[PDB]
Structure 1
Amino acid sequence: HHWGYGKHNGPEHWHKDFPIAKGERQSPVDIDTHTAKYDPSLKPLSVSYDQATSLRILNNGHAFNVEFDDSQDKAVLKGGPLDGTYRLIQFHFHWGSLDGQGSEHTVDKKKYAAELHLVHWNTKYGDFGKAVQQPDGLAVLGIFLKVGSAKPGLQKVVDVLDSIKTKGKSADFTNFDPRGLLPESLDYWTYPGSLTTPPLLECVTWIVLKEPISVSSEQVLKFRKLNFNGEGEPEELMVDNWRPAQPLKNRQIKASFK
């Protein structure tokens, strides 16, 4: 009876195994754009993805995950609200059963069809597993997806999904360039928060871009053909693998713009 996204093991259940679910800095949150504080001391985000090395794509039963070689400073995030250097380890998405839902963060209560998370770990902690035990261990870049025109830079990912349909499948996935998933503007909101799946650790500096990318209906439809179950276990479509917004508590969301 492990955690998942259903009636009996979904987000409202998670606190029984992971009591930090009700903690002081949980994610996602609603971004109320009118109360976010402009901070003119926030630096432009530095996203340096030229040397990224993707390795593999994996269905873990919760999402699909594009993993990168993080054994050197290739693809890194710095600047913005960050002190020091954070290394890209992987990305993944959360999405809906319908185009009207699927994002984790919301903007003035608006849900997007999906949300991309590019996960990076602070190189002061030497690897990802040590970094998640620290208050400033991760920086997650979150990008919203709306359904409209196709994102051409997403298509390589979409086309390999049928090869990892079920829980525990991987595939080699080399030479994927994550710059193809970024919108034009790096204007962002930032706040202190957590992982959005168990173990829900409060180790994340969240950076959420204001500008969504658009993807086509066909591209998100293909995300919804994945399965939460393993091969030869009964079919459960991988849809609605998002956690709802959690109480902001004693936090202020900062804006890099306007």
Structure 2
Amino acid sequence: HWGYGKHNGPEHWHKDFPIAKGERQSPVDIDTHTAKYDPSLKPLSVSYDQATSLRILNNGHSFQVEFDDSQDKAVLKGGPLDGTYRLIQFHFHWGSLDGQGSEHTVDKKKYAAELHLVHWNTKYGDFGKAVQQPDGLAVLGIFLKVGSAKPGLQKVVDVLDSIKTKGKSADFTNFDPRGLLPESLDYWTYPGSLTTPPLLECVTWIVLKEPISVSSEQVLKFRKLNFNGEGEPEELMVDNWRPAQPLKNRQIKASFK
């Protein structure tokens, strides 16, 4: 099975998922001086006022908060997108130390963690159909830096003990993902891929310029999760991030000057 360990980590993924060496892989380093400002880009439109969270799950390589996506409750529109994208889940990537953890980097700077809000294009009817299409997903990426606490993240931090090992889930209702957004919605965008297997090249990435702050205590609680299932040898869930991949024939666009 693939993972983030020495014997099954990202450098090995291509043997089972040859698209790992593809032309539009993620994540990438965002070179701020080379990104192109595009005044054609629209502001993002984040519509999360009716979101309905359902569950939180330790999937063995991250934890994810899942949402009801059977109706246009929580949607993303605008920016570089065409059409309406529904929120299905968010999850994080983080490090063993505060100096690493994010997937995207900015001028080679790593952040302590990265939040992915994953949305699928409703014109494809369901998420499994959307990931086979080059415009099927839109992922909102938010960097986390260590500093002050993020009050809106604490309900998540508080339930992690319940889902410590792989395959455990818990009811997680009435969570409002608006409390995870930064103040500004300025962004970079490029065409890319899922950053875990199957690494499909179906994602429009929208990476926010402004990080959110979280406290050292909040991130430390992430690092107490386990990659293993209950009853198995304890392996702490840390450094579940992929390297920056080559940009190849892609242009990163910025919504801001």
Task: Tell me, yes or no, whether TM beats 0.5.
Answer: yes
Measured after TM superposition, the shift of residue 12 of structure 1 is 0.2
- Deviations along 1:190-211, one digit per CA (max 9) or x if unpaired, are 0000000000000000000000
Cα distance in 1 for partners of 2:210, 2:233 equals: 38
Unaligned runs of 5+ in 2: none
**Secondary structure of 1:82 counterpart:** coil
Residue 180 of structure 1 corresponds to 179
Cα distance in 1 for partners of 2:90, 2:173 equals: 14
Measured after TM superposition, the shift of residue 186 of structure 1 is 0.2
Cα distance in 2 for partners of 1:171, 1:19 equals: 35
Measured after TM superposition, the shift of residue 176 of structure 1 is 0.2
- Deviations along 1:135-173, one digit per CA (max 9) or x if unpaired, are 000000000000000000000000000000000000000
TM-score (norm 1): 0.99
1:81 and 2:80 aligned: yes
Measured after TM superposition, the shift of residue 10 of structure 1 is 0.1
- Deviations along 1:73-113, one digit per CA (max 9) or x if unpaired, are 00000000000000000000000000000000000000000
Cα distance in 2 for partners of 1:213, 1:128 equals: 28
1:148 and 2:147 aligned: yes
Measured after TM superposition, the shift of residue 244 of structure 1 is 0.7
Cα distance in 2 for partners of 1:101, 1:139 equals: 24
Measured after TM superposition, the shift of residue 228 of structure 1 is 0.2
Cα distance in 1 for partners of 2:6, 2:20 equals: 17
TM-score (norm 2): 1.00
Aligned length: 257
Measured after TM superposition, the shift of residue 223 of structure 1 is 0.2
Measured after TM superposition, the shift of residue 189 of structure 1 is 0.1
Moved over 4 A (4+): none
Identity level (%): 99
Measured after TM superposition, the shift of residue 231 of structure 1 is 0.3
Measured after TM superposition, the shift of residue 9 of structure 1 is 0.1
**Secondary structure of 2:19 counterpart:** helix
Residue 70 of structure 1 corresponds to 69
Measured after TM superposition, the shift of residue 221 of structure 1 is 0.1
Measured after TM superposition, the shift of residue 242 of structure 1 is 0.1
Residue 40 of structure 1 corresponds to 39
Cα distance in 2 for partners of 1:36, 1:9 equals: 33
**Secondary structure of 1:124 counterpart:** helix
Measured after TM superposition, the shift of residue 46 of structure 1 is 0.4
Cα distance in 2 for partners of 1:113, 1:244 equals: 14
- Taking only aligned residues, the RMSD between alpha carbons, in angstroms, comes to 0.2
